[PDB]
Amino acid sequence: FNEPLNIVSHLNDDWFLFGDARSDCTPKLDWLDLDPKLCNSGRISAKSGNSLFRSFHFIDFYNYSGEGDQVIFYEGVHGFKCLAYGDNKRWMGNKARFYARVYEKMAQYRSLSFVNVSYAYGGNAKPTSICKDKTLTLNNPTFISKESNYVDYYYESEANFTLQGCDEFIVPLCVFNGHSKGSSSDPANKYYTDSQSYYNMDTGVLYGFNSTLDVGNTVQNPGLDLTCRYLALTPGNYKAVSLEYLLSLPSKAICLRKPKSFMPVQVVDSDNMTAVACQLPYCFFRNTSAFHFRQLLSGLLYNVSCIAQQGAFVYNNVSSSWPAYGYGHCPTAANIGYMAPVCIYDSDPLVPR
Amino acid sequence: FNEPLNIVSHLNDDWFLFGDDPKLCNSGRISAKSGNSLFRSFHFIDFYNYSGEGDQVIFYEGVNFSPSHGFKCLAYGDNKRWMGNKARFYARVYEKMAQYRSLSFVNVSYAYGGNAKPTSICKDKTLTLNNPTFISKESNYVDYYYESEANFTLQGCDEFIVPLCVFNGHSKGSSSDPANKYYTDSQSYYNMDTGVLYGFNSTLDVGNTVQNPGLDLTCRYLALTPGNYKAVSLEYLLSLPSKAICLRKPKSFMPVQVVDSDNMTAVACQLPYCFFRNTRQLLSGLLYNVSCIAQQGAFVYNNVSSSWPAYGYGHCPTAANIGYMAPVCIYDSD
Ligand SMILES: *[C@@H]1O[C@H](CO)[C@@H](O[C@@H]2O[C@H](CO)[C@@H](O[C@@H]3O[C@H](CO[C@H]4O[C@H](CO[C@H]5O[C@H](CO)[C@@H](O)[C@H](O)[C@@H]5O)[C@@H](O)[C@H](O[C@H]5O[C@H](CO)[C@@H](O)[C@H](O)[C@@H]5O)[C@@H]4O)[C@@H](O)[C@H](O[C@H]4O[C@H](CO)[C@@H](O)[C@H](O)[C@@H]4O)[C@@H]3O)[C@H](O)[C@H]2NC(C)=O)[C@H](O)[C@H]1NC(C)=O
Ligand SMILES: *[C@@H]1O[C@H](CO)[C@@H](O[C@@H]2O[C@H](CO)[C@@H](O[C@@H]3O[C@H](CO)[C@@H](O)[C@H](O)[C@@H]3O)[C@H](O)[C@H]2NC(C)=O)[C@H](O)[C@H]1NC(C)=O
Ligand SMILES: *[C@@H]1O[C@H](CO)[C@@H](O[C@@H]2O[C@H](CO)[C@@H](O[C@@H]3O[C@H](CO)[C@@H](O)[C@H](O)[C@@H]3O)[C@H](O)[C@H]2NC(C)=O)[C@H](O)[C@H]1NC(C)=O
Ligand SMILES: *[C@@H]1O[C@H](CO)[C@@H](O[C@@H]2O[C@H](CO)[C@@H](O[C@@H]3O[C@H](CO)[C@@H](O)[C@H](O)[C@@H]3O)[C@H](O)[C@H]2NC(C)=O)[C@H](O)[C@H]1NC(C)=O
Ligand SMILES: *[C@@H]1O[C@H](CO)[C@@H](OC2O[C@H](CO)[C@@H](O)[C@H](O)[C@H]2NC(C)=O)[C@H](O)[C@H]1NC(C)=O
Ligand SMILES: *[C@@H]1O[C@H](CO)[C@@H](O[C@@H]2O[C@H](CO)[C@@H](O)[C@H](O)[C@H]2NC(C)=O)[C@H](O)[C@H]1NC(C)=O
Ligand SMILES: *[C@@H]1O[C@H](CO)[C@@H](O[C@@H]2O[C@H](CO)[C@@H](O)[C@H](O)[C@H]2NC(C)=O)[C@H](O)[C@H]1NC(C)=O
Ligand SMILES: *[C@@H]1O[C@H](CO)[C@@H](O[C@@H]2O[C@H](CO)[C@@H](O)[C@H](O)[C@H]2NC(C)=O)[C@H](O)[C@H]1NC(C)=O
Ligand SMILES: *[C@@H]1O[C@H](CO)[C@@H](O)[C@H](O)[C@H]1NC(C)=O
Ligand SMILES: *[C@@H]1O[C@H](CO)[C@@H](O)[C@H](O)[C@H]1NC(C)=O
Ligand SMILES: *[C@@H]1O[C@H](CO)[C@@H](O)[C@H](O)[C@H]1NC(C)=O
Ligand SMILES: *[C@@H]1O[C@H](CO)[C@@H](O)[C@H](O)[C@H]1NC(C)=O
Ligand SMILES: [K+]
Ligand SMILES: [K+]
């Protein structure tokens, strides 16, 4: 009785679901209408063909926003690389590290949204879309061109940006990891070591990242691509300091607001980078099966009593399993006493109790 | 029935206590030295070789680095900087000991190219700091506007806690310098394998005179993976770790338990990685197992209770409406 169920769910109505499916509600005989009731729900933010990761890094932005105590993620659907001879594995790594940070922090905050980050840069040089391919163009982090008067990429360069209005922000700190090239006119042995740092101007804390690999962007030596760390930053005034190659800084941040009592996120799939990202204590991964977004919605109509490592317990009283990492009102697997002294209602002259 | 008890305890024999009843001294599950603490051993010469391993880890110490004794690096320094250091330190140890079985100390060595050596720059009349080590300038430099560096390797543990510190203020080199001459301390650690850099610049303008007091050492506490590291100093005295907290043997997340002049440990001890317990009858909980350890306290029995355990660990009772299964029962009979 009350076996744990392998599904994402909620304890009450205070939940929110981020998705990459079609969220909208797309008849005298009402059983022909196949929209689930939660279609168009204000507890769902979802766009077919997009995702938090895509909107965080690329031009085809969708304005994901949501607030809830129990946050749920539906993750679903060659691969992206910055350069013709890049490496998509770096992007699989970026994705795992992004969602690790998003999943972890959404166990601590009610509210997620995106904000645009502006910068102040003292030079004349402008942004350049250095990282792209045939279907997608990267715009976060922004990359700033060489000043016309510098003859090569061996220069220092900085810009200011401010983060305001949220408790914490998730931003990308990235470098091209390998032998970066300034131009194809250059010699083969002339390469650069991308180096980037963010500096809190008030606290004096520096987050830095130096390129360390030897890969490049040719058929003989391929692999050069963007490696990103995802930083959770407090609000304040920051300076992006580049010691070599192109200055990069954030153009978009995930805004985190409204702290809650720690409540693990729940994640479900239709790569396994979301699986790698979803770890205890901050995330419960569910490998649910019949898995369409439309089936998820129907499965989110009713509450459950307890959400735990093994799954969802519908009922709050007893189970054959002991809940581990339980949240909510969790059942016991103790077997219940047959009798106690309250039970008998008369003293027997000849039998003991 | 089965109200939660405001005590520290264990779910089984797999527990350990760090600190400063006779029965438990023989248990082989205590590491404690009167007059000392983890923080104190981390930073100072008065070192105790704390060491212990367990699934449920308990801490009962911190008092032996108070504000009433009150340490500062300089005559006109600031103990509150050291209070803040304490909070950050214990925040990191508590969070990490929810994830690892074993805690211990290791000594960290370095390679440095110059002839200059350690200087005990931070000390009061009854305590000398040796972690981080500070390396004095080369005799050939007349000012302190230089770049100094040393290598150090971290080996033998899954993670290491080390201090990254700067003097935060208008740091002085010698009294012979004019008042207007001063330094802005800058320290960083660089992982040569990964390319990740952690840096820290002084941002305050306070000093070490009666007229402008407050210059002391501010430390961040980094959890680093094993590898080859480089301490890079861009100004003032080079500093790098001499001791590290050695974290070993990963475990399924199990919150630490903490019991008690200051409340830095209370700030350090936060859900979900730590359970703080107020006020011995609290330490008596180590004599026996309990079924469930939760935010409200320890639940002795694993079946029923009047409270719903929150952040429960073990075999946790329900607070549903349940009675006894015998047909003879009426009051409380399911
Ligand atoms: C959840 O689990 C708990 C813990 O296991 C369980 O509580 C136990 O229930 C069992 C079975 O009912 C109790 O055992 C019975 O005790 C009968 C005597 O009852 C009196 O004495 C009890 C012993 O008291 C001493 O020890 C306890 C600590 O152990 C200590 O607190 C006391 O101070 C004292 O030193 C006493 O606990 C008990 O008190 C309970 O019941 C009264 C009366 O209703 C109530 O007022 C109290 O609030 C409290 O709930 C009472 O004072 C004894 O006659 C009986 O023996 C018969 O049956 C057994 C088999 O069942 C035969 O072996 C025997 O031959 C007899 O036929 C039996 O031993 C046990 O004492 C409980 N323990 C505790 C700590 O409460 C709950 O029932 C479980 N609940 C559910 C829903 O499953
Ligand atoms: C992380 O990356 C940056 C960029 O590579 C490093 O900064 C650069 O370090 C190199 C090598 O030490 C320096 O090159 C030197 O240039 C000077 C001229 O000033 C010359 O005398 C040397 O022979 C050498 O060619 C370069 O100056 C320096 N650039 C800047 C802007 O500081 C940085 O050191 C790396 N971080 C770590 C921790 O290694
Ligand atoms: C834990 O909670 C659940 C749900 O509240 C309890 O299960 C429910 O138990 C009731 C009472 O026993 C069941 O109703 C009865 O069912 C029997 C047999 O079918 C019937 O003869 C009675 O006339 C009455 O309808 C109910 O079906 C059942 N619900 C479910 C979903 O299974 C359970 O008993 C609780 N367990 C304990 C130990 O408290
Ligand atoms: C954090 O602290 C370090 C150490 O103070 C900063 O590096 C230092 O920055 C100062 C201020 O820009 C540099 O001063 C310059 O000195 C040169 C000659 O030495 C002079 O030609 C310039 O006009 C200027 O006065 C200093 O060189 C530099 N030190 C080193 C070793 O690189 C660092 O910039 C701070 N970090 C951030 C992110 O602000
Ligand atoms: C980025 O931020 C700098 C402030 O630290 C600023 O540099 C200064 O110019 C401001 C403007 O009045 C001065 O108040 C200040 O003295 C300067 N810097 C320092 C450290 O004191 C830069 O100008 C800003 N960059 C851009 C492009 O606006
Ligand atoms: C899931 O639980 C929530 C919170 O308990 C339910 O909200 C309750 O709604 C019913 C009427 O529909 C009321 O009896 C309660 O007072 C409501 N709670 C609050 C806090 O106002 C919600 O109904 C449940 N969802 C489902 C599908 O049963
Ligand atoms: C707490 O529980 C532990 C483990 O369940 C108990 O350790 C057991 O003790 C018995 C009796 O000495 C041994 O026969 C078992 O083999 C022990 N198991 C282990 C894993 O060590 C311990 O006795 C309990 N403590 C108390 C006070 O009851
Ligand atoms: C201080 O404690 C440490 C850690 O427990 C001791 O170092 C360990 O010693 C054992 C052998 O007893 C070795 O197998 C381990 O490799 C050591 N651990 C580490 C991290 O190096 C050390 O011996 C103790 N020092 C003294 C003087 O007793
Ligand atoms: C996008 O969402 C943000 C945060 O929820 C909101 O403030 C803003 O109205 C939205 N922007 C647009 C263009 O709709
Ligand atoms: C950021 O920019 C995009 C497109 O320029 C816009 O639609 C979005 O609403 C902006 N976010 C905010 C918080 O204004
Ligand atoms: C580190 O050094 C201290 C003081 O000399 C010593 O007592 C301790 O045993 C050393 N630790 C290790 C792991 O060698
Ligand atoms: C530190 O390591 C670097 C790289 O391995 C090496 O070039 C240098 O000689 C080392 N410095 C010292 C002082 O040993
Ligand atoms: K750069
Ligand atoms: K320094």
Numbering used by the authors:
A (entry chain A): 25 to 50, 58 to 108, 114 to 306, 315 to 334, 348 to 410
B (entry chain B): 25 to 44, 66 to 305, 314 to 332, 351 to 405
Kindly provide excerpts from the paper associated with this entry.
Murine coronaviruses, however, occur in two closely related biotypes that differ in HE ligand/substrate preference. One of these -represented by mouse hepatitis virus (MHV) strain DVIM- displays the presumptive ancestral specificity and targets 9-O-Ac-Sias, while the other -represented by MHV strain S- appears to have evolved to use 4-O-Ac-Sias instead (for supplementary introduction see Text S1 and Figure S1). It assembles into homodimers and the monomers are composed of three modules: a small membrane-proximal (MP), a receptor-binding (R), and a central esterase (E) domain.
Crystals of free MHV-S HE and of a complex of HE0 with αNeu4,5Ac22Me diffracted to 2.1 and 2.5 Å resolution, respectively. The structure of the R domain, however, was resolved, and in the complex the ligand molecule is well-defined. While the overall organization of the MHV-S RBS is similar to that of BCoV-Mebus HE, the orientation of the receptor analogue with respect to the RBS is strikingly different. As compared to the ligand in the BCoV-Mebus HE binding site, the αNeu4,5Ac22Me receptor analogue is rotated by about 90° and shifted by about 2.5 Å. The Ser220 main chain nitrogen accepts an additional, weak hydrogen bond from the C8 hydroxyl group of the ligand. Moreover, the hydrophobic patch in the BCoV-Mebus HE RBS that interacts with the Sia 5-N-acetyl group apparently changed into a shallow pocket that accommodates the Sia 4-O-acetyl moiety. In accordance, single Ala substitutions of Leu119, Ile166, Phe212, Leu260, or Tyr281 all reduced receptor-binding activity (although that of Ile166 to lesser extent) as shown by hemagglutination assay and solid-phase lectin binding assay.
